From a paper:
Neutralizing antibodies target the [name] (HA), a trimeric protein containing “stem” (also known as the “stalk”) and “head” domains in each protomer. The head domain includes the Receptor Binding Site (RBS), making this domain the primary target of neutralizing antibodies by blocking virus attachment to host cells. The stem domain contains the fusion peptide, which is targeted by a smaller subset of neutralizing antibodies that prevent membrane fusion. Other designs, such as centralized conserved and computationally optimized broadly reactive antigen ([name]) HA proteins, retain the subtype-specific structural architecture in both domains while seeking to accentuate the conserved features common to circulating strains.
To better understand the resilience of mAb [name]-1 to genetic drift, we characterized the structural features of binding by single particle cryo-EM analysis of the fragment antigen binding (Fab) region of [name]-1 in complex with the [name] HA [name]. The resulting map at 3.24 Å resolution revealed that [name]-1 binds [name] at a membrane-proximal epitope in the stem domain. While possessing a footprint that overlaps the well-characterized CR8020 and CR8043 stem-binding antibodies, [name]-1 binds in a different orientation. Compared to these other two antibodies, [name]-1 is rotated with the light and heavy chains positioned in a planar rather than vertical pose relative to the HA. This results in a binding interface that involves the light chain to a greater degree, overall encompassing a greater number of residues in the buried surface area. The heavy chain of [name]-1 presents a predominantly hydrophobic surface at the points of contact in the complementary determining region (CDR) loops—F37 and Y38 in CDR loop 1, W55 in loop 2, and a series of isoleucine, valine, and leucine residues in positions 109–113 of loop 3. The main contribution appears to be a pocket in the light chain formed by Y37, Y107, and Y116 that accommodates the aliphatic side chain of HA K2 through a stabilizing hydrogen bond with Y116. Given the binding position of [name]-1 and its direct contact with the fusion peptide, we hypothesized that this antibody would be able to interfere with the conversion of the HA from the HA0 precursor to the HA1/HA2 primed state. Similar to the established CR8020 antibody, [name]-1 strongly diminishes the conversion of [name] HA [name] from the HA0 to HA1/HA2 state.
Author numbering:
A (entry chain J), E (entry chain I): 2 to 9, 11 to 30, 35 to 59, 62 to 72, 74 to 110, 113 to 119
B (entry chain B): 1 to 99
C (entry chain M): 4 to 9, 11 to 31, 35 to 57, 65 to 72, 74 to 80, 83 to 110, 113 to 126
D (entry chain B): 272 to 500
F (entry chain C): 329 to 500
């Protein structure tokens, strides 16, 4: 069970950023995937979750419309697209494989 | 002591099966050693020790082999024109007339 | 538990033996047993848990139990009768298995 | 071996040997309808079911369980049986139908092997007292391969038959337990130690009725749920 | 199922008497063993019972302290020690293998 | 399962993320979901599996001298007979090996499933009237169970008479 990511790109404000999370070592469509971010000096700010078995997603109280995510089952991966970049949104993005009984599980 | 008096409005019907103290051990495909109440030795590891010829007619080459009887020698001259269903040779047999 | 001190019967006649009791021993729903014995050698069990026999006893003996008393009847009496009989049961007032007192003369 | 007078179907260099068993250890050279030869020193067919020695003592009170935690001693009436406790005293009985079915199946399984040997009148020589070459080595090799194959077949057959017998004589007791549960319907609750607890005032006749299969649960179902619920 | 005994010794009053009961043909630690005695002209007087699986014993109403019994599982046997011999205690001692459903069972 | 999720087991869903043992337990109550393992059942299963495996491994038989099984010449009828007996032996042993593997796999798969039908019937007997089989793979207990009741059920110490007074009050 391992989750790798690709988030080394940098964009100007007002542009769009794509981040990819690839999962291996477990059945891809069996667990909720979570997207969270962390900024220096602040606690982790949770963003949303996605079910790879379908298109159902859920977001936080302030991340409606400005962030989207999709899944590719044939290549067992997920993508997150974030637009409307702002100076306060400069942070490091973590991908999580949630488990309902074992807790947050593995990170990335 | 003992169990208190049997209850007036409850029965305790029970089901079971017999058992023996000298349980014989036996092997299966899942467990190597289990205990069974009764078991029979399938393999006959003992012999009576004597040969008898009630259903099968048996000829006995006391002092000669089959070839010695066939060729014709005095020590088995009683074997002429005989018939058998089994010919048992003896380890003490020996050719006499010619090598 | 006690047995009538004397009872007699000619061969071919039925003989009835009864055990006394109370609510503590016979009235509690526990089993009752009879023992056929010679005073010097040993006792031998009669009756069973159910109304059967311990597969070594001839059909000459019949046993029954009631609400407060139990009985053993011998119908086909022969000359092989060892004339000594004792009752046996379990008591709740005292937690010891209790045998009976009795005496029989064939006459 | 010296020659005597008796009746026997197979002849071996050791002597006579009865045909009433499917295998043998005496020798590998036979005449007549002799059984198969194997290498195992001993082999046992389970002409019976599993054995659990009785542990009737439980501290000071005692135990009455059966078929799950305690096999029953002192029961020669039959294989499978019954016990009960009520106001008329504890007792014991046997089920003739189930034990008769089990005995018939066991006897058929046993008669499948015993007495069904095949004639083997003439065979190759299986003992030698000289070095001869390649044909003698081939005969020894084919003899050894046949013996090894038949030994493996015998061991596998014994294991399979023992497994199936032990499971048959246990599914036949899971049956007649489910059957009694169905007969009692809502009037009995499985204690889990091996048997039931009946919640109505059963007597010496109700136990016999349950054993026979005549038991009608509708009569006592009015009070069984009143006692248990 | 058989129970043999050894009780042929004789002692003076005030001494001690040891009696041994040996069981065979059945699982030793599975059934309650009973000790009873019989005197001429009297009914059988039951004494006590012992569980060979443990040390638990039970006595009658008048046999407290004056009689003891012990068990040896390795040699599947039981011993009974009686002290304070009196003229009224001259009797023959029987050993019993009790069964809770088949009655008193076998004797000795 | 859509948006809510699933918790079933042994009937519709095998469990991932459990290395404690083979067979296990889960629970849900007011103290939170959890997971545990049964050491007795998994130890019995492992012992049986190891015995079955040790039956074959290391129990080979000596085969010091045999006939020649390779040839570089046409010789006649005896060579053909040797090739034929070699082929028949190889074919018989191949069939025996395949049948043995199939039988052992079938018996192992059924053993490690009857051992889970057991400990399910056993738990049902322990709970008696206090639990109802949901049918998706496990029970639903109708009394106010806590972190101690689950452990008691796992141990076998559980006494149903204490909570049987309220289990039927909740379920009936
Ligand atoms: C164990 O089972 C065997 C086989 O059924 C029993 O042996 C049979 O005994 C009867 C009664 O003497 C004979 O008529 C049969 O011919 C026997 N058959 C065989 C195959 O030996 C044996 O009696 C059983 N053991 C016990 C203790 O009852
Ligand atoms: C087989 O031949 C042997 C000789 O090698 C015979 O042995 C003796 O034969 C004489 C014949 O007059 C007898 O008097 C002796 O008693 C025999 N001795 C022994 C030790 O057997 C033998 O009789 C011949 N026949 C058989 C059937 O063995
Ligand atoms: C009778 O059977 C026995 C075994 O029950 C045979 O004795 C073995 O025979 C082989 C082959 O000759 C020897 O290598 C062994 O040393 C013998 N003993 C054992 C214990 O295996 C015997 O050959 C058979 N025949 C006769 C005539 O006795
Ligand atoms: C059973 O009935 C008897 C009278 O026959 C009574 O004395 C006893 O108390 C009853 N037992 C119970 C447990 O109610
Ligand atoms: C039921 O079984 C009992 C006990 O053996 C017997 O007395 C009775 O005749 C049987 N048959 C019935 C009640 O039809
Ligand atoms: C029951 O299991 C629990 C959980 O592991 C443990 O804490 C407890 O000691 C066990 N035994 C009991 C209650 O006898």
């Amino acid at each position: 069970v391992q989750l790798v990511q690709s988030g080394a790109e940098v964009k100007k404000p007002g542009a769009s950023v794509k981040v990819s999370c690839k999962a291996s070592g477990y059945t891809f469509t069996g667990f909720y995937l979570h997207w969270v971010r962390q900024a220096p000096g602040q606690g982790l700010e949770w963003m949303g979750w996605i079910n790879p078995h379908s298109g159902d997603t859920d977001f936080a109280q302030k991340f409606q419309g400005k962030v989207t995510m999709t899944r590719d089952t044939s290549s067992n991966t997920v993508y997150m697209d974030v637009n409307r970049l702002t100076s306060d949104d400069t942070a490091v993005y973590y991908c999580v494989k949630n488990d309902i009984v074992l807790g947050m599980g593995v990170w990335g | 002591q003992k169990i208190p008096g049997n209850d007036n409005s409850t029965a305790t019907l029970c089901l079971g099966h017999h058992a023996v103290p000298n349980g014989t051990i036996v092997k299966t495909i899942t467990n190597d050693r289990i205990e069974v109440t009764n078991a029979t030795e399938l393999v006959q590891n003992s012999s009576i020790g004597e040969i008898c010829d009630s259903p099968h007619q048996i000829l006995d080459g006391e002092n000669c082999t089959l070839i010695d009887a066939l060729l014709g020698d005095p020590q088995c001259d009683g074997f002429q024109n005989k018939k058998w269903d089994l010919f048992v040779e003896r380890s003490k047999a020996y050719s006499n007339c010619y090598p | 538990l006690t047995q009538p001190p004397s009872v007699s019967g000619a061969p071919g006649q039925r003989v009835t033996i009864s055990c006394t009791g109370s609510s503590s021993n016979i009235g509690a729903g526990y089993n009752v047993y009879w023992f056929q014995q010679l005073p010097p050698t040993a006792p031998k069990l009669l009756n069973y848990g159910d109304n059967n026999r311990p597969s070594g006893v001839p059909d000459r003996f019949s046993a029954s139990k009631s609400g407060t008393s139990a009985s053993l009847a011998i119908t086909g009496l022969q000359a092989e009768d060892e004339a000594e009989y004792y009752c046996q049961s379990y008591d709740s007032s005292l937690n010891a298995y209790v045998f009976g007192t009795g005496t029989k003369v064939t006459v | 071996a010296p020659i005597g007078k008796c009746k026997s179907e197979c002849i071996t260099p050791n002597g006579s040997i009865p045909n009433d068993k499917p295998f043998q250890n005496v020798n590998r050279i036979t005449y007549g309808a002799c059984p198969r030869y194997v290498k195992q020193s001993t082999l046992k067919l389970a002409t019976g079911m599993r054995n659990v020695p009785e542990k009737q003592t439980r501290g000071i009170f005692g135990a009455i369980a059966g078929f799950i935690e305690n096999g029953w001693e002192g029961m020669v009436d039959g294989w499978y049986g019954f016990r009960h406790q009520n106001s008329e005293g504890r007792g014991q009985a046997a089920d003739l139908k189930s034990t008769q079915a089990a005995i018939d199946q066991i006897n058929g399984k046993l008669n499948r092997l015993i007495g069904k040997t095949n004639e083997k009148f003439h065979q190759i020589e299986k003992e030698f007292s000289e070095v001869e070459g390649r044909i003698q080595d081939l005969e020894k090799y084919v003899e050894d391969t046949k013996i090894d194959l038949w030994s493996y077949n015998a061991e596998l057959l014994v294991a399979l038959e023992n497994q199936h017998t032990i499971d048959l004589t246990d599914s036949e007791m899971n049956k007649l337990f489910e059957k009694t549960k169905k007969q009692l319907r809502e009037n009995a609750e499985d204690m889990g130690n091996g048997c039931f607890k009946i919640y109505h005032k059963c007597d010496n006749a109700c136990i016999g009725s349950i054993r026979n299969g005549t038991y009608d649960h509708n009569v006592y179902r009015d009070e069984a749920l009143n006692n248990r619920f």
